[PDB]
Design a protein around this ligand. Structure first.
Ligand code: BEF
Ligand code: BEF
Ligand SMILES: [Mg+2]
Ligand SMILES: [Mg+2]
Lengths: 219, 219
DNA sequence: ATTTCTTAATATTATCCTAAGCAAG
DNA sequence: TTGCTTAGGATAATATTAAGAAATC
């Protein structure tokens, strides 16, 4: 992953860079606020380590400037400004950690590791067949570029279907999926729900298997 | 929003709680790991402060297990174990931050603010949906060019709504953001608050999603 | 001293079931 | 024959009010 490091003392800068190389990340150092602005413009960084005492611009003004611009990457301020009063200012500015100089390098590597652990990991679970996009995580359904309201049961069927997509699910499975198991209606409930589901999602991407169960079209 | 605090020293434990409450979060404190274990199952916590020295089992064992079970909540270790070897170990288990005792409360509050800002928001200090502007750190909300006086609970909702905006937020979560487990109302308080909230921000920026919860509209 | 929160009785709607008269496999 | 289709009426689910307890100021 690409780490930008921002340090005005170039002696340290080469140190931080070497550490980042060594820990296994891809790294860029820059010695000033302006140069960093540039690197960020062109490159895609997974993180930013930033000193506050930069010659051209104050690090926080730089930080505040970035988030205004909707630059969202994790930032670890690594600075020599050690006041409780400062740390708060750094963290409220939108930094994701604050590490004071002097510092144990191995602390830094690990703090660095912790921010990255979450970054790569935002994976929210979707399984989709054709132009229907479904969020098992966010609960929202898309035909093309518009969205769909599915009722608790309507959603619950089309859910079970896209998990099993391509294969017929026995109808009694869906009756037990739409019910707590002790609640089974005399009339055809499942049949109505599939009709509705079909009617919105473009009937039919669910193609019916007579005498057994139901299934939906993917390939 | 709800914070779980885990502390064996009850003097501090009662202390942290008031601190957390005062910041606008609703809070649960517990004195042991096992109590913590059971609480996590029942309630939805937005962050966990976790002490290490604990009577039943060491926090790290609890943390490792949470992580093993794919518990995604941000955890801030606040411990008295300060050697650098310890600090690295916690983060590597891992915590999203590690803070040694004694500590400035105001550092803790700001670090916590930072983790939640990163978890729920893009890392952004403010959130905008439509003409709604919210400042997460100031606890302040702007509808259009005008300000909104929202009660503590009205705010805690509209906040959770805007973070998740576009995605229906499940009812059990909104409710869990507003109550400490000791205050859990028998009646339908959430339904009213949303009504009250609605009357302020207007009908209808909140679209109710039946059988699930409430959700907020952007596009 | 006044806001904010709850309680609980009543109106109200999405979603659901029901049944009847129909279309396919 | 089995499964699809429709709507008017049943049912949970959520809204509304209001005022009575709690919390803040
Ligand atoms: F110049 Be940095 F804050 F050490
Ligand atoms: F027991 Be904890 F580490 F303060
Ligand atoms: Mg410097
Ligand atoms: Mg302890």
């Amino acid at each position: 992953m690409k780490i930008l490091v921002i340090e005005d003392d170039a002696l340290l800068l080469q140190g931080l860079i070497l550490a980042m190389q060594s820990e296994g990340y891809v790294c860029d150092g820059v010695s000033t606020a302006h140069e960093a602005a540039l690197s960020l413009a062109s490159n895609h960084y997974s993180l930013i380590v930033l000193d506050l005492g930069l010659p051209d611009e104050d690090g926080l003004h730089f930080l505040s400037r970035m988030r205004r611009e909707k630059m969202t990457q994790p930032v670890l301020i690594l600075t020599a400004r050690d006041t409780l009063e400062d740390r708060i200012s750094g963290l409220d500015t939108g930094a994701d950690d604050y590490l004071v100089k002097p510092f144990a390098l191995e602390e830094l590597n690990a703090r660095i590791r912790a921010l990255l652990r979450r970054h790569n990991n935002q994976g929210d679970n979707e399984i989709s067949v054709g132009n229907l996009r479904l969020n098992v995580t966010r609960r929202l359904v898309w035909l093309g570029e518009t969205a769909l309201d599915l009722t608790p049961k309507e959603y619950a069927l089309l859910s079970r279907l896209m998990m099993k997509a391509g294969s017929p699910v026995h109808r009694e499975i869906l009756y037990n999926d739409i019910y707590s198991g002790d609640n089974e209606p005399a009339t055809n409930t499942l049949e109505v729900h599939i009709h509705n589901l079909r009617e919105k999602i473009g009937k039919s991407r669910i193609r019916t298997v007579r005498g057994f169960g139901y299934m939906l079209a993917n390939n």
